[PDB]
Write a protein that binds this ligand. Structure first.
Ligand SMILES: [Zn+2]
Ligand SMILES: [Zn+2]
Ligand SMILES: [Zn+2]
Ligand SMILES: [Zn+2]
Ligand SMILES: [Zn+2]
Ligand SMILES: [Zn+2]
Ligand SMILES: [Zn+2]
Ligand SMILES: [Zn+2]
Lengths: 400, 400, 400, 400
């Protein structure tokens, strides 16, 4: 309430701090939105974001590590100037890679903005405290290459998440939801090797790798009837031959599989493997099945963090109702990944979403959800009961 | 020529003997044609043919063994009443099984007739000899179940062909040819076993044996592009499920494969096996691949017997241009299997061929080809140079 | 409460009446369970149920019409002996057809029991009223052939539902739910006509109707990737040829399609039709696509009836969380179709569910849900606000 | 015989003239073989061959038209310096385009050589005549782009063949045959157009053009069972999608069809068209079926020219036993297209055939067949009975 320095006042201060930074946060958005960059090539975005935190006053009060483990990833940290337990480490993630051809059709410029905004708001609320604040470290991580590769996984492998206690990010969508079901994903490239022959003269001396590709497609297609409705299989024939006068000796398929858990994903992947090896057996070709570098995990929900986020969203006026490398993060750190409406009916990964992601209209919705994240971070800092419940829900759901 | 008892006179006598028997030979044809019987059920045909040879005058001069190794097979033998090398054993085959639904749509009634006629003609020509005839045994074998099962193979397994020196038969067709390419054949029944489930509720708990059948079909179909043009693959889905509400747990396919040699047939069969096992692997079903009881061999040509037959056919006015268990015979005894026109344009295995096979018109053509066979048998008896050349061509072509 | 003759007392009386009838209700269950009968052949079940209502005391107080529009359907009615608006007509449905081979693996014996029990309970509660009861007619309809054919649709076509105001039934399942999503369904038989030919000699003169069946299967299979996850396609190749020596001239497929609305079902059906006609075009065959006699509709929910049912279920101790011809009923009369747990983990349409459906354990759960239905019927009788809300929700959801 | 200037002496003189030119003919071969060029890009070959005929002594005695209708085609003519019926026009064809990657793997350098050699030999035999020679025009046509495009067809369209009476060429192969069955050919490019959608979110909003490609492949594959054994279908999936996250909206197939006559080719092409349009219908895509620029015709045999060629080949020591745009020529001018062994077991269109085509060993065989062609041209010049029989066989076989 209106008490000396209540939690409510700290939440208000975080909101006022985000409002105060609205103009430079929107410039941050537009600098990324207007210069879209693909996975692992976000050199401009990396420049913009590192400069953003280096310039936050007082300059150098954010400790900024550019080129953190990846050339376009960065890390930025702030903690109250204090000294003598263990400090609470709260992480905020920024995404900023675009999509080929259509630009920021997933609003990743606003994910960068919302992670920066929420971290500014937590710092400003903690600087507004008179008595020494509890020991907290605000950590911002720039995570490149969400659409391809999975920069958070590169960062997990580097140990970047091993000391975080809770991690926050949010994603622009078509409605406001504290959690939506993101699924595990496994990528594969399938290559078939046969034996060239002149189809005009001696076709029976060939081993037809195009046949292998089509049979694999047929094999997977009838299998769809026995997939679970939550399972997904999608793929293309990237190479299906070069000229009709030669029985093709090479073919190449590229496929994705998705399922709501890793146990199901491995069942689905094994059935697909059988389908690919069947096509080799039937055609007389050999086959190479090369899995992707980084399987994406499903996102593990956190009930306690979920409820505390929705309560803050309600106060802010928020009404509530694929796959991401945030799933891998959520398996090693309790986290939340809310989706938020930005005033558009367009769907993600379409050109009209690129328009909405860059719009002035989206800015209000983006800063509002950033306020919700910061208030929730303040919840975790000042409610030890919540932190333990968060940890309890994290340990329990990990039993899977 | 007009010499004492030249070979030419003996050939004339065999022709006159067949002409003399034309009425009872045609009654033999009509008795089988008018009462068609299927493989291994030719009880009436077996009765007709055994009675035919028992009644040839003088009665019992043909030594007749009814129910010879098979209930509807028979054996009939005649040799000149003589005594003291090795006698020449010349075999003549009678077929007499019909086709389901359409009756004697392959003219098998005329194969019975032509084998009987040729054997009568050889005996009559040898009885016309004054001086003691060379030692010869005329052997007639009734071989049931040509269209299904392969009665000649049952008879080979019983040893019926191990003492024959040359074997003759002929087959009504659409033109006169001393030899046509009959191919090796392998039959298979394929059964897939999956796991039933309610497709309405839990289809993903099923293993779909109908899928296996369709994938095998697809696998074989793309393979056609790499078959040799002489290869043949034909098959049906005999069982493809029972009701749509249950994921089928059983499916059944029936296939035939044909190739011009046993070496090629085994290559084709192995590629098909891969196709069937691929469908099991892709679908999660198990599979049973049960080969037929009797593979049919291709028919081995005999150049020497071929040329001597055509020379006799020319003198008679004959102008010259699938798979059968005669192929298996031709691998163990030098033989010929000429095809003969019967005055019809109809194709074998059609209803109009049943009409032609029963027609009065066909009788002239049938007796004419029987004359050609008997004259050729007389060639082998009285030309030791031909017998050795026949044996030479048989040993040489067996190198395969 | 404990008031003169409150609604609560009437609900208690309906429960006590069902308890009083428990022994004869269970005998009714066992008489159907132990003599399973298939769609339109439920002659014993029809005898059992008509006799049940004719024997309810005082005898003939239920007005019973055997052989009502269908040989095994029946209608039974009771109303308070009263006289001088419009009477409320409340319908209760009894199902009683079994499944081939496995008997009452859907618990339809308990659907018969629960519809009878609920109607007895409403009558007993209304006979317990001192002052004249409001004008109500309790209607029981025996609806045969739910698993195949759709007896409720036969009955709709006869006008049986045109004067009902609300209709009640319940279905044994694996949990207690006031509503579960039953989908629209369309059945089709597909027949392909080609041209026979001897595959041994002239396969190129055939038009292969087995090919048509396999291509249709392939066409539908790749289409699965673009179906909605709620859509269902299931089918078998009932006839796929007869013998491999003849290019098949006939093939036959049987398929079901399901979608959550009639608009979606027609989209799905049209895409399938394209798949079937494509297979004819590719193969050179003609095709006949014969839709089923009775499309099943999805079940239209009724929010008001839903909430009033759950409130009664809670008081009774009930804890809450395919396609049926009840969907067609729910499009013409406001209705509910709750599912209820019967003390088993077995799934419907399995043999172990037949065991549970016949068990003594199931009887407690069956009578409890019948109590819930009767109390809800009493809700509609004595709450005009509920009746209008029920009608409002019915008109609104019909806008689809 | 040894008569004044018999035909035999003229044939000998043509052989001696070819022997005299062997060194420069082999240089001609090596100049093309060592600098392989593809269809319509044979600028060096065109330079070599035009220069060859311009340099034949006396210089300019061959009337040479470079860049004749096509940039790399040429025409060269010689006739006896004479004057006052109609002159006999005899054509000789030179091919000279190579194959991508493997060079002159069809020996086209030797087709150029053999057509040049035969024309030199006819001229030299006619210059050796004392009395005025009959009026003859020796025409050499360079026909580019045999492997792709069909330069003879470009030349037919320009009228180049309308005044020729007989046309000669020969093709290096694996044995010596006066005629081998070259088939009619039709090329098609098939493009499918669907509707992109995000397969991750809304795959059911896509229309899958990759599905169309696979279904067309399936459609054609089952059709193989009903093709004639002489028919050929071969094709590739040139474009089968770009990335798995987007339902492909475009696919592209490239196919060839071959049959022994134009009537059969059109039947085969129509059945394939049905297969392509079926895939569009099943998938919801539209389709464009674009036939090739130039259908190749089968080669029409000429019995009279055939027999006269073989008789000359025998005297020379020659022992006798796909598709080409020479087929289109043979439909408008009586011609022959013998194949000749060149001392190699390698197959055409393989790298080892490129070795043989360039070998010193091949030169003897090439000049020998050129001698046979020239002698046959002398046959036509000096046997009016042969010319009429040639024309008779040409008119008769055109009835097709
Ligand atoms: Zn995205
Ligand atoms: Zn995203
Ligand atoms: Zn037959
Ligand atoms: Zn036969
Ligand atoms: Zn049921
Ligand atoms: Zn049911
Ligand atoms: Zn070539
Ligand atoms: Zn060539």
């Amino acid at each position: 309430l209106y008490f000396q320095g209540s939690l409510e006042l700290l939440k208000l201060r975080s909101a006022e701090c985000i409002d105060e930074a609205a103009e430079r946060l929107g410039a941050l958005s537009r600098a990324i939105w207007s210069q879209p960059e693909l996975a692992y090539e976000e050199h401009h975005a990396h420049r913009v974001l590192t400069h953003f935190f280096e310039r936050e006053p007082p300059a150098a009060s954010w400790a900024v590590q550019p080129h953190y483990q990846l050339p376009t990833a960065f890390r930025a940290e702030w903690e109250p100037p204090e000294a003598r337990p263990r400090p609470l480490h709260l992480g905020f993630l920024c995404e900023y890679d675009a999509l080929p051809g259509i630009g920021h059709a997933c609003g990743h410029n606003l994910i960068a903005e919302v992670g920066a905004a929420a971290a500014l708001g937590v710092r400003g609320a903690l600087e507004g405290l008179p008595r020494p604040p509890p020991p907290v470290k605000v950590v911002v991580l720039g995570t490149p290459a969400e659409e391809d590769g999975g920069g958070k996984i590169d960062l997990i492998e580097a140990g970047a998440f091993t000391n975080l206690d809770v991690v926050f990010m949010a994603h622009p969508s078509q409605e406001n939801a504290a959690y939506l079901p993101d699924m595990a994903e496994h990528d594969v490239t399938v290559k078939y090797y046969g034996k060239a022959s002149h189809s005009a003269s001696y076709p029976w001396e060939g081993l037809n790798a195009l046949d292998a590709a089509v049979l694999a497609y047929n094999n997977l297609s009838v299998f769809r009837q026995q997939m679970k409705p939550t399972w997904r299989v999608h793929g293309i024939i990237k190479n299906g031959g070069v000229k009709p006068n030669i029985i093709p000796s090479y073919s190449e398929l590229i496929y994705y599989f998705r399922a709501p858990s890793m146990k199901e994903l491995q069942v689905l992947t094994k059935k697909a493997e059988d389908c690919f090896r069947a096509a080799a057996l039937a055609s007389g070709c050999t086959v190479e099945i090369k899995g992707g570098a980084h399987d994406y995990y499903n996102v593990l929900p956190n009930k306690s963090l979920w409820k505390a986020y929705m309560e803050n969203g309600r106060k802010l006026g928020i009404e509530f109702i694929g796959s991401t490398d945030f799933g891998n993060v959520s398996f090693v750190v309790p986290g939340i990944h809310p989706y938020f409406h930005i005033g558009s009916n367009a769907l993600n990964h379409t050109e009209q979403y690129t328009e909405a992601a860059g719009s002035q209209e989206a800015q209000f919705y983006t800063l509002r959800t950033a306020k919700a994240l910061a208030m929730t971070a303040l919840d975790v800092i000042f409610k030890p009961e919540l932190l333990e419940g968060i940890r309890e829900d994290f340990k329990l759901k990990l039993q899977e």
